Amino acid sequence: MDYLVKALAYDGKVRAYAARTTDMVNEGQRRHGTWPTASAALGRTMTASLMLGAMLKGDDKLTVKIEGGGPIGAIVADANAKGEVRAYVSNPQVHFDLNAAGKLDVRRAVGTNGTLSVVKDLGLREFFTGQVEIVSGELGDDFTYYLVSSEQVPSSVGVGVLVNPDNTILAAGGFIIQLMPGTDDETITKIEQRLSQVEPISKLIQKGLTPEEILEEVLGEKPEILETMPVRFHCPCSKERFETAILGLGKKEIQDMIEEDGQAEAVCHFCNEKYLFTKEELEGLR
Amino acid sequence: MDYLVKALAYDGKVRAYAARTTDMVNEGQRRHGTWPTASAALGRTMTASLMLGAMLKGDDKLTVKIEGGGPIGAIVADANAKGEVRAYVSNPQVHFDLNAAGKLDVRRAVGTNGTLSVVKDLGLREFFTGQVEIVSGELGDDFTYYLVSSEQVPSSVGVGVLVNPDNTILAAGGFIIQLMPGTDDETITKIEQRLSQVEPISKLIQKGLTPEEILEEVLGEKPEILETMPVRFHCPCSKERFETAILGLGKKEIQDMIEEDGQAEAVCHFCNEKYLFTKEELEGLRDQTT
Amino acid sequence: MDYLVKALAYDGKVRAYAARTTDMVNEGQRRHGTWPTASAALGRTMTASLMLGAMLKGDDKLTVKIEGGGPIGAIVADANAKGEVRAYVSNPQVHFDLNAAGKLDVRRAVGTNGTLSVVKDLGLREFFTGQVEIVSGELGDDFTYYLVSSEQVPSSVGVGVLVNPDNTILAAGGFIIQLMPGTDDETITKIEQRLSQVEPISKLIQKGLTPEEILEEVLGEKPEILETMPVRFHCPCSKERFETAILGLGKKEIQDMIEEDGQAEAVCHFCNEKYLFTKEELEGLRDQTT
Amino acid sequence: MDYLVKALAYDGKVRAYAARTTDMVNEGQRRHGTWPTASAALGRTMTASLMLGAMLKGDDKLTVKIEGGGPIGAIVADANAKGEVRAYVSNPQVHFDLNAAGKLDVRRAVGTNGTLSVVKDLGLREFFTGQVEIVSGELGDDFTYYLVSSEQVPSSVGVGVLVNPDNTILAAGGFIIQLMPGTDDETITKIEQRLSQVEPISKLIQKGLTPEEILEEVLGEKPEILETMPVRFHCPCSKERFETAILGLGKKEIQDMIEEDGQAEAVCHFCNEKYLFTKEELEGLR
């Protein structure tokens, strides 16, 4: 039921993407136990990251790191060309009152003193990196700035997350609209005004609009859908793997951890799975 | 008379660039005293860099570095948004027998085990880097691979340099063509055919085709010109830069210079400009420095 | 009271370095507002860099860059031959649950897919670079691997940082031991035993062991001291540097600053020093710039 | 009969290397057809490079590139931990009169406006590089400067090549002496003076001294020999390999080269083996 669409509009002058990510954002919330404001920052990042990741091909993948000096600390999302995302926030426990407009105060959680970086991993010696300063802190506008100023593509990013009173996620989705080099300086203005006039993405997702519908409303025309794909929260961590974490400590600290408890545990930061090594298992190296 | 153009074609679905860089590549050859194979590697790199630079705006700028492990060492080119390039290679006097096609063996000079990287300065606190493997060593195809990797639109970079027996440059130029979204398949196979179907770019320049004409030839239609700009080899070094560096050595090292040599020649590695500090200049610096 | 020593031991067959860097790592923590795990990565890197720097002479200097792919991003440290370090991490507010040994999970912050590189400026036209894979992520072992790769003598780098619950630094220090040619096997197994047999370096510092005492403890004999030096966190940035950068933006961008903000804050990314340009200062710059 | 020794002296305070490279330098001369002055530059580079290469371990390897602006152009040598060297000069045809001292005028051939670089390849993302300016042009003293100033190890390099009237090589060999960190400022002076007083390496190789003997004369004591190994000119190029060169041109220039000659050739720059592709062979791609 979560998915992403790749689209064109205006006869190939607009390259567009849209997604519905309610289930994956709910899974992020549950795994990390984020408080509402942190959920909003997490889901906004996850959704934007997924759509960046969909711009990739094949086995290529990317990582977004945001750390604006606010109490949530660093937010990291991995996304790939298959629409698999894993993401965490460094401090899930962030509470503030609503802002003046009655929305979760994401910019106070994130902070605006630091950077948004995107690292694309194409192979062992092949990568593309980009970095800008966080100028908004609401995340959607920071991703816009990344696209416009580091990637130098005229773009508009909208991401929205609605949090239920019980702290679960009601809805999440977003879009990215990009104007291609060919676009005549006049059709640019038709789209820029219609974007500036349509309802914010949070309102659109509140009404239950699908990704195609969101693109149509925001664009003022039905888009050519190039591809739809399913998307999911996914983290490939496993116990064998955390072994290497534990191996990396050695035979000393390993002989300890035990002789003192008869066990040890390690935690995946992306998905919060916990791995317990029993006494027998720990002995299998020491 | 060297210059570059920015262009669209096929109702804005093709974005294109082209340049004639004979004079600037000749300046590089002259400054660094490259041998033919190395001039070809240097001038291909310069021309490709200039065109990437043309995709920037304002005061932005970029640096290309090729390090394939070959005898030429590193090839480094700075390019800004205003049509100015400076470039050097580690080892300018690099040359070989002609390759099996009777052309300059650029791949042998460059090496095929290493990377091509592009680092962009896009303003205070806006940063972009890319790095790809060298896949060819002939450079045109490497830049194509960098562009396709970077922007994931079909791209084609052509660059050429013809060198005279006296080691001077006879011609240099290039183009970049990129097919944006919504390019229909008729235009693709038009363009791809033309591409893998038309003459070498350095002979088009030698024939005296303009940048505009080259795009017409390659594209199959007259391009829409968005901008033309003069271009040149330029390094902003000056004697003052080197004076400052000599000062930073301290009195002792300077006095060594005066005593064993009576003078000092400082050389910019980017453009090989040579600056001479007389005994008296150096005495002034020894006495100025703390 | 932070300082570093240079030493020999076992009749000159062992070359050694040690430092107490509590205060400088505390300055880095404070400047950048690192969270515990990131302070440990930052301070380990700083201390290792300082000691590498101590192997240099004169005005020479070096830059360490760690890029393992982890959440902290890049860790960059400049170190000179005069005991001065500046360093930053991309993302200071990085932290996790304790690792399986109940210690700060530095490897998780750093990542284990990337490189550690060292670029040395050894004078006008003398250059040295090294780069190795990250093998651990815990940093001590990575620096050891860099040194063994570089000089091919048995080496050991220890570095530690203890952080308080309030995020301040309680202790930081380190050592490097290298076994030169002709070290007999009795001294090797002496040293290797001691090494893989003695307490953590950050607790030795907390206990209030000096650098000298730490080398004694690790080596099994009192070292011969060759040099002691004061050390510190220092970044030579100043408001003037940023003024110059603002000037370089042009009148228009500056006027935007004045109009939308009434002022401008410029921040050094190396040391996070914050410089404030009042409306009037900015008016001065807008009018000065061409 | 060519070989290299690894040594210590002065109870581990001196780390030393020496080699006899007459046969490999003769092979370089024959392959490239160097004229005498070029032979001297080539052999000096080969011998120094071999001894640098012996400092390496395992499968690690290095490349020395020298290009001083003189008529010989770029000199490149590869050397590995096994003492395999391959090396060429860009212009083998360099003639000058003898210098004032009656020796081949290597510095006029090489030139002193450019750099000596050494790249050590430890793996795909692992390398050490060093570069200095060429300050002598005679090569031995440039290698000394590389070791002293880039690698920061107090060192003395001696390399010598004697060329026969018939242009073949009569002798070639060299040494490197390094002073270790422990060396007391007084035993440094005993060695520095004895080095400054002994006969130049060309004279020593003229008299037929082996590597061990050269170390003993230059050191003033018999060295501890740690290892001896055989050394050779070796280049692993093959026809299959040059295929990739030719493949890298494509199917067009390939269809040509032929339809016009019925063949094509490519040449290894390091060893000057020539590879001929027949009409049938060229067709096996086009």
Ligand SMILES: [Zn+2]
């Ligand atoms: Zn996980």
Ligand SMILES: [Zn+2]
């Ligand atoms: Zn210059």
Ligand SMILES: [Zn+2]
């Ligand atoms: Zn600073």
Ligand SMILES: [Zn+2]
């Ligand atoms: Zn060969």
